């Protein structure tokens, strides 16, 4: 349960982007999306919900 | 110094360079570039 909770919360996932790559003609902006980021410190690791 | 011997030495130097010109097609350069070994990975999204 400890291990399973780590890779579920301490993870670097990759989501697509706004305005993708095959876009809708008239799209003004193209920006990437950030979801979950890899944890940095000991306090952040002390806050994993089991 | 007689001629007939030398006029054959020229033929050796003629045919040796004439066979060395068969490096056709000869490239423009001479490799200058300090070797470039590239690693590439793609993580989509």
Q: What is the spatial distance between Cα A34 and Cα A17, in angstroms, rounded to a whole number?
A: 9
- Among the listed residues A16, A22, A21, A48, the one whose alpha carbon sits nearest the alpha carbon of residue A34: A16
- Among the listed residues A21, A16, A14, A20, the one whose alpha carbon sits nearest the alpha carbon of residue A36: A14
Q: How was this structure determined?
A: X-ray
Q: What secondary structure letter does DSSP report for B23?
A: G
CA dihedral A23, A27, A30, A33 (to 10 degrees): -70
- Residue A9, token pair as written in the block: 């919360």
Task: Please give the span between the terminal C-alpha atoms of chain B, in angstroms, as a whole number.
Answer: 83
Write out chain B residues lying below 8 Å of A16, CB-based: 45
Are the beta carbons of A32 and A19 closer than 8 angstroms? no
**What residues does A17 pair with on adjacent strands?**
A32
HSE-up of residue A44 (Cα within 13 Å, Cβ side): 9
Write out chain A residues lying below 8 Å of B41, CB-based: none
Asked if the C-beta of A35 comes within 8 angstroms of chain B's C-beta atoms, the answer is: no
- Among the listed residues A49, A17, A15, A47, the one whose alpha carbon sits nearest the alpha carbon of residue A31: A17
- Among the listed residues A18, A3, A14, the one whose alpha carbon sits nearest the alpha carbon of residue A48: A3
The resolution, in Å, is 3.4
Q: What is the spatial distance between Cα A13 and Cα A3, in angstroms, rounded to a whole number?
A: 18
- Residue B7: CB atoms within 10 A of its CB come to 9
């Amino acid at each position: 349960d400890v291990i399973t909770a780590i890779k579920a919360q301490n993870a670097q996932v990759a989501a697509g982007q706004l305005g993708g790559t095959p876009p809708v003609k008239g799209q003004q902006l193209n920006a990437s999306i950030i979801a979950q980021t890899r944890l940095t410190s000991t306090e952040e690791f002390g806050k994993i919900l089991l | 110094d007689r001629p007939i011997f030398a006029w054959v030495i020229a033929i050796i130097i003629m045919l040796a360079g004439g066979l060395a010109i068969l490096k056709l097609p000869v490239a423009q350069y001479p490799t200058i570039a300090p070797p470039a070994v590239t690693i590439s990975a793609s993580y989509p999204g």
